[PDB]
Amino acid sequence: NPYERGPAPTNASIEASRGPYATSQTSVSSLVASGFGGGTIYYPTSTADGTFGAVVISPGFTAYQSSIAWLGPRLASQGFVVFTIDTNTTLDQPDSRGRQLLSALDYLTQRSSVRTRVDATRLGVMGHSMGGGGSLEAAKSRTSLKAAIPLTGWNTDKTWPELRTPTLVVGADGDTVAPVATHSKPFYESLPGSLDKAYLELRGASHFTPNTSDTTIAKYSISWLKRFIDSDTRYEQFLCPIPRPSLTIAEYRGTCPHTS
């Protein structure tokens, strides 16, 4: 597999706050950004191992990059180009957020100063709250996306039978803003039965747990991106068989074994 990056993984390496790649960052001003509010790109400094897949991340309603910034370095140091974006306005709805995720990927791969570090065929989307509902909208418009990860996602559209993108749905047991009963579980249950997918419900968490460093979110997000953006079968072991309920996991559902 030409897309494998970094050493063989262990449970410790996916839980680490800083992966094997040293990282750098650049800012993209809102003046230059076409179709979105600007953002920050986090990327491995080294070009010696080849190009990397890329992930764009959107914040939620009334939120800015500061709410999702901790994911930048944390994911990029595992061998990803990661773009945390601001939206045009903080009141934008999920469908608009989905269009902005795709415009940010377009900018990153076609016009940014790190476009030669990125493999434009291997892209993913992530978001928190309404941004998470936007990640589903983006995967509906662009079915070549390799991974989608909504974090305590919010969307009035509950059913997604069109998706072909492997999706990890992350919910929080105590979320009162986007309750898993009416947002996250319905999203998960409506995805095609043949799709590689998974539902992770955090234990003792709220709607704002994803806005601060969380080892459980990080380890499964890293594994999911490695497995599907890089096709890296060394990370399948963390996902299948599915994890059991624990101190940090309230519930986990999944289609194992994966067929991507």
Tab-separated table of C-alpha atoms in Angstrom:
chain	number	residue	atom	x	y	z
A	1	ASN	CA	0.000	0.000	0.000
A	2	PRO	CA	1.665	3.194	-1.239
A	3	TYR	CA	-0.429	5.348	1.131
A	4	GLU	CA	0.823	3.804	4.377
A	5	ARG	CA	2.503	6.417	6.554
A	6	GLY	CA	4.353	6.062	9.839
A	7	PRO	CA	5.284	3.011	11.900
A	8	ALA	CA	3.070	0.072	12.814
A	9	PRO	CA	0.477	1.378	15.250
A	10	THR	CA	-0.255	0.357	18.833
A	11	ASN	CA	-3.028	1.417	21.222
A	12	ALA	CA	-0.488	3.840	22.758
A	13	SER	CA	0.397	5.484	19.424
A	14	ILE	CA	-3.270	6.285	18.603
A	15	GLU	CA	-3.872	7.637	22.102
A	16	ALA	CA	-0.778	9.868	22.036
A	17	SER	CA	-1.352	13.639	21.875
A	18	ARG	CA	1.371	14.006	19.253
A	19	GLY	CA	1.896	11.375	16.553
A	20	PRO	CA	5.143	10.567	14.744
A	21	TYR	CA	5.131	13.477	12.249
A	22	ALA	CA	6.475	16.888	13.280
A	23	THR	CA	3.934	19.465	12.033
A	24	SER	CA	3.777	23.011	10.714
A	25	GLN	CA	0.884	25.414	10.182
A	26	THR	CA	-0.224	28.224	7.887
A	27	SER	CA	-3.197	30.611	8.034
A	28	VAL	CA	-5.647	31.268	5.213
A	29	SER	CA	-7.279	34.682	5.535
A	30	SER	CA	-10.983	35.153	4.851
A	31	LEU	CA	-10.039	37.693	2.149
A	32	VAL	CA	-8.298	35.007	0.079
A	33	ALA	CA	-10.681	32.114	0.810
A	34	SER	CA	-13.323	31.591	-1.868
A	35	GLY	CA	-16.661	30.358	-0.542
A	36	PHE	CA	-15.746	29.951	3.153
A	37	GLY	CA	-14.447	32.092	6.036
A	38	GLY	CA	-10.718	31.240	5.953
A	39	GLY	CA	-8.930	28.834	8.345
A	40	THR	CA	-5.706	27.191	9.489
A	41	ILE	CA	-3.876	24.387	7.737
A	42	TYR	CA	-1.879	21.898	9.840
A	43	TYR	CA	0.507	19.606	7.938
A	44	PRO	CA	3.484	17.290	8.402
A	45	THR	CA	6.728	19.186	7.857
A	46	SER	CA	8.436	16.300	6.117
A	47	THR	CA	7.895	15.739	2.402
A	48	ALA	CA	10.186	12.702	2.314
A	49	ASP	CA	7.436	10.090	2.725
A	50	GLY	CA	5.227	11.425	-0.111
A	51	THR	CA	1.883	13.233	-0.150
A	52	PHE	CA	-0.900	12.862	2.419
A	53	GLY	CA	-4.689	12.681	2.444
A	54	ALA	CA	-6.539	15.775	3.698
A	55	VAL	CA	-9.403	16.429	6.088
A	56	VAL	CA	-11.423	19.659	6.476
A	57	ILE	CA	-13.190	20.388	9.755
A	58	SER	CA	-16.118	22.717	10.409
A	59	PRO	CA	-17.238	24.216	13.726
A	60	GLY	CA	-20.900	24.473	14.792
A	61	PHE	CA	-23.560	27.180	15.156
A	62	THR	CA	-22.185	30.441	16.627
A	63	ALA	CA	-18.708	28.852	16.863
A	64	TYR	CA	-15.277	29.617	15.401
A	65	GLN	CA	-12.046	27.687	14.741
A	66	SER	CA	-11.089	27.882	18.424
A	67	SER	CA	-13.765	25.234	19.159
A	68	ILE	CA	-12.089	22.615	16.926
A	69	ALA	CA	-8.468	23.754	16.926
A	70	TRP	CA	-7.197	20.908	19.163
A	71	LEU	CA	-7.883	18.427	16.324
A	72	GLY	CA	-5.439	20.254	14.014
A	73	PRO	CA	-2.082	19.229	15.462
A	74	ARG	CA	-3.449	16.021	16.963
A	75	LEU	CA	-4.577	14.573	13.617
A	76	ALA	CA	-1.924	16.202	11.426
A	77	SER	CA	0.921	14.607	13.462
A	78	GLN	CA	-0.468	11.180	12.474
A	79	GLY	CA	0.177	11.989	8.784
A	80	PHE	CA	-2.717	14.130	7.517
A	81	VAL	CA	-3.133	17.646	6.079
A	82	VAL	CA	-5.881	19.108	8.290
A	83	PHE	CA	-7.793	22.324	7.574
A	84	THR	CA	-9.869	23.823	10.377
A	85	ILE	CA	-12.170	26.417	8.799
A	86	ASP	CA	-14.333	29.350	9.812
A	87	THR	CA	-17.679	29.593	7.977
A	88	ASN	CA	-18.966	32.656	6.090
A	89	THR	CA	-21.127	33.596	9.070
A	90	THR	CA	-21.525	31.750	12.400
A	91	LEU	CA	-25.267	31.367	11.737
A	92	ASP	CA	-24.875	29.329	8.533
A	93	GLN	CA	-27.057	26.203	8.356
A	94	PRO	CA	-25.907	22.612	7.716
A	95	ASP	CA	-26.457	22.659	3.933
A	96	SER	CA	-24.382	25.840	3.618
A	97	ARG	CA	-21.705	24.346	5.882
A	98	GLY	CA	-21.532	21.320	3.578
A	99	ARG	CA	-20.899	23.569	0.571
A	100	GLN	CA	-18.222	25.436	2.503
A	101	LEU	CA	-16.427	22.199	3.404
A	102	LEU	CA	-16.212	21.346	-0.306
A	103	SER	CA	-15.068	24.876	-1.227
A	104	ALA	CA	-12.339	24.623	1.420
A	105	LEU	CA	-11.158	21.296	-0.029
A	106	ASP	CA	-11.128	22.920	-3.495
A	107	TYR	CA	-9.039	25.811	-2.169
A	108	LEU	CA	-6.651	23.489	-0.300
A	109	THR	CA	-5.987	21.140	-3.234
A	110	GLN	CA	-6.021	23.613	-6.124
A	111	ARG	CA	-4.788	26.956	-4.763
A	112	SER	CA	-3.163	26.796	-1.317
A	113	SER	CA	0.547	26.935	-0.585
A	114	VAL	CA	0.496	23.289	0.624
A	115	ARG	CA	-1.362	21.846	-2.394
A	116	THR	CA	1.727	19.875	-3.468
A	117	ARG	CA	1.755	18.020	-0.113
A	118	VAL	CA	-1.804	16.809	-0.613
A	119	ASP	CA	-3.145	13.861	-2.598
A	120	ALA	CA	-6.346	15.391	-3.997
A	121	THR	CA	-7.943	11.956	-4.586
A	122	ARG	CA	-8.001	11.081	-0.851
A	123	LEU	CA	-10.135	13.570	1.067
A	124	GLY	CA	-12.368	13.527	4.128
A	125	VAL	CA	-14.720	15.786	6.072
A	126	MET	CA	-15.452	16.260	9.781
A	127	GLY	CA	-17.418	18.787	11.861
A	128	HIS	CA	-18.955	19.540	15.257
A	129	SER	CA	-22.705	20.029	15.747
A	130	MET	CA	-24.184	21.844	12.708
A	131	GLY	CA	-20.715	21.404	11.110
A	132	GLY	CA	-21.216	17.658	11.640
A	133	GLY	CA	-24.600	17.878	9.895
A	134	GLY	CA	-22.657	19.760	7.162
A	135	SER	CA	-20.199	16.851	6.822
A	136	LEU	CA	-23.104	14.575	5.862
A	137	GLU	CA	-24.374	17.162	3.355
A	138	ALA	CA	-20.885	17.323	1.839
A	139	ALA	CA	-20.697	13.512	1.520
A	140	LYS	CA	-24.117	13.582	-0.183
A	141	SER	CA	-22.828	16.025	-2.850
A	142	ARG	CA	-19.415	14.444	-3.297
A	143	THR	CA	-19.657	10.671	-2.982
A	144	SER	CA	-15.923	10.211	-3.750
A	145	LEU	CA	-15.044	11.462	-0.242
A	146	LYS	CA	-13.168	8.693	1.604
A	147	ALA	CA	-14.309	9.430	5.186
A	148	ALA	CA	-16.935	11.457	7.048
A	149	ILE	CA	-16.956	11.998	10.832
A	150	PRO	CA	-19.771	14.056	12.391
A	151	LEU	CA	-19.048	14.919	16.068
A	152	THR	CA	-22.322	15.294	18.043
A	153	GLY	CA	-23.959	16.193	14.742
A	154	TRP	CA	-27.065	18.342	14.279
A	155	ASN	CA	-29.274	18.343	11.174
A	156	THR	CA	-32.998	18.589	10.483
A	157	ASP	CA	-32.532	16.106	7.611
A	158	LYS	CA	-32.388	12.747	9.372
A	159	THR	CA	-32.077	10.173	6.561
A	160	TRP	CA	-28.933	9.556	4.461
A	161	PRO	CA	-29.401	6.532	2.175
A	162	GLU	CA	-27.377	8.161	-0.626
A	163	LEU	CA	-24.006	8.043	1.170
A	164	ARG	CA	-21.140	5.947	-0.175
A	165	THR	CA	-18.548	7.427	2.187
A	166	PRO	CA	-17.478	5.358	5.212
A	167	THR	CA	-18.885	7.280	8.152
A	168	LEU	CA	-18.123	7.237	11.872
A	169	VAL	CA	-21.001	8.880	13.818
A	170	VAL	CA	-19.876	10.226	17.201
A	171	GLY	CA	-22.605	10.970	19.763
A	172	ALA	CA	-22.587	12.006	23.432
A	173	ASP	CA	-24.835	10.299	26.016
A	174	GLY	CA	-25.688	13.542	27.858
A	175	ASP	CA	-26.085	15.808	24.811
A	176	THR	CA	-29.192	17.952	25.201
A	177	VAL	CA	-28.468	20.141	22.164
A	178	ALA	CA	-28.334	17.424	19.520
A	179	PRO	CA	-29.781	14.436	21.395
A	180	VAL	CA	-28.538	11.111	20.015
A	181	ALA	CA	-32.140	9.830	19.952
A	182	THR	CA	-33.185	12.414	17.316
A	183	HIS	CA	-29.932	13.249	15.500
A	184	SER	CA	-26.949	10.846	15.727
A	185	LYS	CA	-28.835	7.502	15.993
A	186	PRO	CA	-31.276	8.292	13.176
A	187	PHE	CA	-28.304	9.358	11.034
A	188	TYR	CA	-26.496	6.078	11.745
A	189	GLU	CA	-29.550	3.851	11.236
A	190	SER	CA	-30.469	5.459	7.898
A	191	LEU	CA	-27.035	4.843	6.312
A	192	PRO	CA	-26.944	1.952	3.813
A	193	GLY	CA	-26.569	-1.453	5.440
A	194	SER	CA	-23.645	-2.393	3.171
A	195	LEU	CA	-21.659	0.768	4.000
A	196	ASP	CA	-18.563	0.555	6.220
A	197	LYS	CA	-19.931	2.619	9.158
A	198	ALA	CA	-19.837	2.923	12.948
A	199	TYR	CA	-21.600	4.631	15.829
A	200	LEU	CA	-19.591	5.695	18.884
A	201	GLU	CA	-21.535	7.039	21.862
A	202	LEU	CA	-19.320	8.656	24.497
A	203	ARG	CA	-20.097	7.968	28.154
A	204	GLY	CA	-20.465	10.891	30.568
A	205	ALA	CA	-20.188	13.474	27.797
A	206	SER	CA	-22.113	16.525	26.642
A	207	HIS	CA	-22.573	18.515	23.440
A	208	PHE	CA	-19.326	20.405	24.220
A	209	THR	CA	-17.076	17.402	24.914
A	210	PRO	CA	-15.717	17.503	21.326
A	211	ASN	CA	-14.487	21.118	21.802
A	212	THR	CA	-11.732	20.052	24.233
A	213	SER	CA	-9.041	17.366	23.830
A	214	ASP	CA	-10.623	13.925	24.193
A	215	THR	CA	-8.576	10.715	23.872
A	216	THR	CA	-11.577	8.579	22.866
A	217	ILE	CA	-12.603	10.942	20.054
A	218	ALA	CA	-8.966	11.182	18.960
A	219	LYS	CA	-8.102	7.475	18.892
A	220	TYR	CA	-11.185	6.416	16.889
A	221	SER	CA	-10.967	9.450	14.589
A	222	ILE	CA	-7.336	8.650	13.803
A	223	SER	CA	-8.106	4.968	13.208
A	224	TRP	CA	-11.083	5.764	10.988
A	225	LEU	CA	-9.109	8.240	8.862
A	226	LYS	CA	-6.106	5.910	8.595
A	227	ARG	CA	-8.318	2.982	7.596
A	228	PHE	CA	-10.330	4.843	4.929
A	229	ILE	CA	-8.332	7.861	3.695
A	230	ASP	CA	-5.120	5.825	3.523
A	231	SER	CA	-6.725	2.380	3.061
A	232	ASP	CA	-4.355	1.454	5.894
A	233	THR	CA	-5.357	-2.054	6.974
A	234	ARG	CA	-2.931	-1.891	9.939
A	235	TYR	CA	-5.593	0.188	11.732
A	236	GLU	CA	-8.497	-2.220	11.125
A	237	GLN	CA	-7.529	-3.983	14.380
A	238	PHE	CA	-8.716	-1.006	16.469
A	239	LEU	CA	-12.103	-0.909	14.787
A	240	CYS	CA	-12.947	-4.587	14.289
A	241	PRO	CA	-14.100	-6.439	16.186
A	242	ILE	CA	-16.012	-3.441	17.568
A	243	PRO	CA	-14.967	-2.089	20.955
A	244	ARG	CA	-16.987	-3.083	24.006
A	245	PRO	CA	-18.714	-0.630	26.337
A	246	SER	CA	-16.291	0.792	28.883
A	247	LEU	CA	-15.587	3.788	31.120
A	248	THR	CA	-15.394	6.089	28.097
A	249	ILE	CA	-17.666	4.228	25.646
A	250	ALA	CA	-21.401	3.974	26.389
A	251	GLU	CA	-22.263	2.122	23.180
A	252	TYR	CA	-20.575	1.202	19.884
A	253	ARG	CA	-22.230	-0.211	16.737
A	254	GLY	CA	-20.417	-1.141	13.485
A	255	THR	CA	-20.362	-3.262	10.319
A	256	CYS	CA	-17.299	-5.478	10.737
A	257	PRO	CA	-15.354	-6.648	9.015
A	258	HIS	CA	-14.824	-3.645	6.725
A	259	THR	CA	-14.903	-4.236	2.945
A	260	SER	CA	-13.173	-0.885	1.681
